cowpea mosaic virus, large (L) subunit
Amino acid sequence: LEADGCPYLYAIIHDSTTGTISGDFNLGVKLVGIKDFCGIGSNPGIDGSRLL
Amino acid sequence: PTTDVIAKLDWSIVNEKCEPTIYHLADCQNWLPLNRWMGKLTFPQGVTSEVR
Amino acid sequence: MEQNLFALSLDDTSSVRGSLLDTKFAQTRVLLSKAMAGGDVLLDEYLYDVVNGQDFRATVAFLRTHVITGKIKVTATTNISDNSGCCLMLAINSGVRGKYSTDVYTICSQDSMTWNPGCKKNFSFTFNPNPCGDSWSAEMISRSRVRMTVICVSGWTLSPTTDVIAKLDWSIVNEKCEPTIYHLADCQNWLPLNRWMGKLTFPQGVTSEVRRMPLSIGGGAGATQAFLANMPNSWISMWRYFRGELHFEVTKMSSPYIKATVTFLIAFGNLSDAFGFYESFPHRIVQFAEVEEKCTLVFSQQEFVTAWSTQVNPRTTLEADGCPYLYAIIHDSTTGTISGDFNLGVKLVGIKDFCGIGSNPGIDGSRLL
Amino acid sequence: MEQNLFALSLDDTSSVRGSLLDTKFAQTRVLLSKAMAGGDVLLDEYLYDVVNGQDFRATVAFLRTHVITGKIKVTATTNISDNSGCCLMLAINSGVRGKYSTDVYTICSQDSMTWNPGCKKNFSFTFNPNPCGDSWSAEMISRSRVRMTVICVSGWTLSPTTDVIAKLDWSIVNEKCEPTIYHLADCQNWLPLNRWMGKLTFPQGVTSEVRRMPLSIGGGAGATQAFLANMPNSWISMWRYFRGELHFEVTKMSSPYIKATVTFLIAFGNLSDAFGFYESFPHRIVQFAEVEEKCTLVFSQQEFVTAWSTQVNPRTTLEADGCPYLYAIIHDSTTGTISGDFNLGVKLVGIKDFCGIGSNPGIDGSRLL
């Protein structure tokens, strides 16, 4: 993490999660698409990917 | 729920037109649909501070 | 290359302004225990201290601008499931002295914001920390000791499973600052009072409840062999008799699961709780939808035939009190599939077309709020 | 009361701007010992670190704005009595690698500001830390390792009685960022080089001094069994032969008390120091007033009959060097009622109507600067 020079989408809790019922607050997040996409250069590739 | 639940799916053919969703290798595209799942954020109830 | 440094824009004497992002100077965390109770002081400290370990975009500007011209805006964030609720209040007062009272009554006269997290998921308001003028500054509010107190006016009807946290956001906005100066003119068209009338608590049940709030509001709120007062209440006490169009704000402080229909009217102290014909008087009927929390009652001059005493002798019995009362009555019954009382907050916001009559020599003490 | 927080201006994505007061993000203190010498590195560190313990109006904004669009402006403040002087240089380079050279030659190619505190009492310049584009950001210059080095290019002619301090002020200004990209076009109308030609030192005396700087600038500055080069100098070396209108900047690096009249001209390596008729060639005569420190020489295309070699074999004797030289000659004599040499700094700023001819296979090494 300290060496990752690319940006991250951050999700932060502004106050606190609550409820008069037990349960976690679960959010689903999906990158629908990119507008004005720009691909640069050919990727030779890297095997594998960090955990989702 | 106090019981098992049932969802009813209805399949019909509608009069909207069919359209292709073809991917190509243009460096610049104005809309690259990805639908790439970023993850399921789970925040536990509590006065704690969470960052994803 | 070489420049005339005297000419540069280093002496920029302007107030802070910009987007809300650039205009924010501090954030505060207030902890609401899962068992807070009402009276509970959640955070009480000088306004200035709110800016302490802060490192937001306008923090330095807030501290180094000599004359700030905009208002302070506070935004509170917190929310609970729809089967619970409570009532919080953020208040600002120009100062404190001694072992001061932090009761709702005492703290809500100057600038307050009061909401129910079960009905609203955020709440904001703007204020001018310098009531005499149209500008202030960090150094000024610091040295002059402006206080910021947050209290639980009414606790959770049903406790959240965990302690809860409210996040306060402090920003400077571009609204203009305006004084709120009080003067001795017998007739004024708007006398803001923000005088707390009380917390009505109605137990769930088929029983009949009647609440009587006296309009002879002189003195203050009663306390044990003492009384509490604030500048606005003390000010109206200068007058012997008074009259005007009264404006009240009713807040639903209980969870939205507790339901009741209350009817408000003006009548005299001598009607009995069993009087069966309260609705033969002109009245209003209040019911709150799940998400609703506030209501405004306006009693016009046509509801009062003459002026009444600002204050009545404390030992004045109900049967002998000749001044009008605001009555809160339960139209049907309080209910809920959850245990809890139906709690309402009532505040006399101000009087329109106020009329003060004669000098009040004064009476020591006040009936119980 | 309750608001749609998603709608507020919290996603304000704009660059920092405002008065110089609101637009300042850091200040730096550089210490000039009373015995600094020239070569002396006064402060050398990553640009980003300059923003460390800072608490000015734009510090947070500088760090939290994702895309900054304006230029950085540095202002230096310091000044000495008129009988002393020296020459300082603030330089910016996109990176460093290894046990790098911090010689004037090596550091002044990208963005530099160079002055004499005895002539100027402050000096400022603006720069774009991202030469490929028109925007940058704190995170970018941090991760990409942009360097900021301040050196003494020439020491005090006469020492101040105490150590001196220069105060650097860093602000973001509203000028637009622009790339400074190099390409391989044989003809370009402006090839910025900022190639340091050398420090001319003329001793006080009735003697005759001649300085010869070679225009066959390929390779770099000579060093002990090594050479130093920088991107612009390396770039022009790609060409076998070259030609163009040369633009030079001459800086008076000595105290204003040391006076001399130098004459600049273009001639070949084989004239002797004793040649008595240098002024039979087209030339310019330079004299600096007390407060003047810079001069600009422009040698037009009419001073060169053909193109010359970008680089000549290192072992090429003066008598055999067939390429032109910039000559600096003392017209009268160097004097002063104080001891000190007359020191001039000379830099080839760029070439107008540059013309590169053929590919240079290369020669290892370069004559001494």
Q: What stands out?
A: The longest strand of chain A covers residues 25-38.
